[PDB]
């Protein structure tokens, strides 16, 4: 059996990009091994992903490889070179890597974006050295400091970030995922809704300062779609897609594939809402729809059991074998 | 291997009927389709269920079936028609589906349960012309607006949408599913002024009193009192619907309240004690909320395949 | 796609089997506050060979009732208006104990009243029915009882709580003829939320010196739970658990989380670096024994949480467990 579909097919942007969430936030690990991840990048393969994204090299005292400068500072030896590891499952499966910048946290704990862009002038060359110069699949960076507004240092931290990671890469892609400050933009607040969401103006007028500041050095912007409102979809996307064409930034979206909506944070997401964004993203002319997070919310080995139903309703809407 | 009980087996009241979650209100979507509805109808008439309520036609924005009232409203075209889904999963395994009136949210975010009867003025006629009319197991309505105490156009909705209801279909069962206002209806997991027994049965009185002549059935859900306070609360509840001559469902919740996740499946033995404090007080049927995520052998979670075979042990089901 | 047959191991960049080993478990009945699995006899008898599998030599029945749920037919409990369980799930621990050659320790009763108040003195007097009952139905009967869980926990200096675990420990020492008895407290630290209060090592040391001057002739051993303090805290926190131990002549246990406490959801299981680490701390320290909360829910292939089996191979990989 197969559900009868009253919506046209294949009608929405594809996703051909995720985030390899390693160090995570606020995802409870899987605890997969090499066997594991490889056949996750064979799931990946299937439904055309091309590009993988290690969201943060390392988040306060936890790492993602053996950082000479981070073991140095009194972070924590990891059990596995997951950099070495991404690298290579993405030269097997023919996929570009995107190495997300490091996290201390300081920027988390003061508000202050340029606190994190000391330690990144030491990751950002040794990873260079260490990785980037030997591994063929290292194709991009990911600038992993988030905001969604206008943001003490922000402008500062993304163009010494995009700078550096350009110039010692001889030019490769850079990128951020931002989010919006929508009426789901909660997070310690203590409250289910926002009634003080950003309007459509505000976020235009503080984007279109951060973006005059930074597209030099930033290639492409992927906001986090999951913030606002469903039927806010086309007047958010139309503006971001608006403000990256003026300054010639490629717009892609991040289709969170969690949802915001429910009391557990985070399950999969009901398929038509990842729909419904997904088809906004192409009635706006996006270049690219990245999603955080296949591993844990579409794929069939996800331990969330829905992510693995998540992916048969997705290649069934998008005709994939 | 069986464990070895050491209480009488099949000495509560079988769960006969559950709630198909769509539109969920909190509840993680499984991302289904029709194949593995098709196999969850398969898993619940193995244990005898014989009535699925898809629990509200709509909810907000969000709708089951491709609604012309709603979609003139603004509300989102859903990828599936889950109405003719259900309907005919119902129909080939010989089930009655319930179909549960439409929740605009207006009346969650004022308390005046009156709001929701307009926009299901539209639902009930519609959808007895698209489905009621068209498809044999079509049986029967959900009223979906809840409440536990005496509410704001509560009594003048559930007669306004009982009514039209009947009328249309020329008479066929209604039911509600209100909760008790309880030690567990929250901070916190649990408080110390819930509803004493004698002020819940004086605004019940006076509901059932206003509704009972288009309402036939009412299903507390169980889960808001304590495992202790059950006799208590089913037995003045079974006593109202005798008064009224209604039915006296239970709604034996299939999760668990007691627990730090909101929600997962229950522990076993709570369950098993509020189907047998259903028989102790004497109830027609008890249904659930919710086979498919809390009782199914397909759930993700894991521990209702589990409470499946626990549930099959207890009532000696092969 | 499939998954690649044979070894297809990370490649571990830190030495390998460095911490100290898991061996033993509670078994989290009656819980407070993990969601029920739902299993029976069949799916306890697979979990005590997973348990086998990685040495676990230990079970623990976390507490033997909680407030109106047992996991026993108490006569006792059941004249005080308690619920009479479906299972007897002391028999059938005790049964699979034995069949598995493991040691079974009995948790005692959590009335809810010293959680209601904050005197841990409230939970004496029905214990000492429970205990009494228990010995007689269970503890003369079957060969696998042995030892006493003394389940009230604490992490600071608690009204009654001296008092408690001197009169608790005492009564199952005199019953049982001597069998061992432990607590499993928890740190006051930066992740006891339920900071930037958490107690310092100082405070800390001077108040469990004073509880281990007080309850060291009846209790045995200490397991306090890990996870409520940074992961670099491990080594000041366990090099003082482990001087008061030695100072009071007990032994110093770890009860290594298996759930993950910095996470959105509580809980699923943890990150293995993360138990790795807890792990080599306590080997650091010179720790007598690793127990865990909680095997079932955190690390089995069996749990309904799936990456906790993915644990379970993490943790035999680390430790070359066949
Ligand atoms: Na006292």
């Not at 717009?251 to 429910?262: G, L, V, Y």
Request: proline share 3%; charged share 30%.
């Amino acid at each position: 059996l197969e559900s009868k579909l009253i919506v046209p097919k294949n009608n929405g942007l594809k996703i051909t990009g995720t985030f390899l969430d390693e160090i995570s936030h606020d995802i409870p690990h899987q605890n997969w091994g090499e066997k594991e991840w490889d056949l996750d990048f064979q799931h990946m393969k299937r439904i055309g992903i091309d590009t993988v994204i290690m969201i943060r090299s390392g988040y306060r005292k936890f790492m993602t490889y053996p950082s000479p400068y981070l073991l140095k500072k009194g972070c924590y030896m990891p059990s596995v070179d997951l950099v070495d590891m991404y690298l290579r499952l993405a030269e097997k499966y023919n996929m570009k890597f995107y190495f997300g910048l490091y996290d201390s946290g300081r920027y988390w704990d003061t508000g202050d974006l340029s606190w994190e862009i000391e330690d990144n002038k030491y990751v950002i060359d040794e990873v260079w050295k260490m990785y980037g110069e030997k591994y063929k699949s290292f194709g991009g960076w990911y600038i992993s400091g988030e905001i969604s507004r206008a943001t003490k240092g922000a402008i500062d931290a993304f163009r010494a970030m995009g700078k550096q990671c350009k110039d010692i890469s001889n030019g490769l892609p850079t990128f951020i995922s931002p989010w919006i400050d929508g009426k789901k933009a909660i997070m310690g607040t203590g409250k289910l809704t926002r009634e003080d969401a950003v309007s459509v103006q505000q976020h235009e007028k503080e984007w279109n300062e951060i973006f005059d500041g930074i597209h030099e050095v930033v290639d492409a912007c992927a906001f986090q779609d999951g913030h606002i409102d469903y039927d806010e979809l086309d007047a958010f996307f139309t503006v971001n897609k608006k403000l990256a064409d003026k300054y010639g930034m490629q717009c892609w979206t991040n289709a969170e594939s969690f949802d915001r909506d429910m009391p557990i944070r985070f399950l999969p997401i009901k398929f038509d809402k990842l729909r419904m964004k997904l088809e906004a993203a192409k009635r706006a002319g996006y270049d690219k729809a990245i999603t955080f997070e296949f591993s844990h919310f579409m794929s069939p080995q996800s331990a969330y059991l829905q992510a693995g139903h998540l992916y048969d309703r997705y290649r069934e809407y998008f005709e994939i074998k």
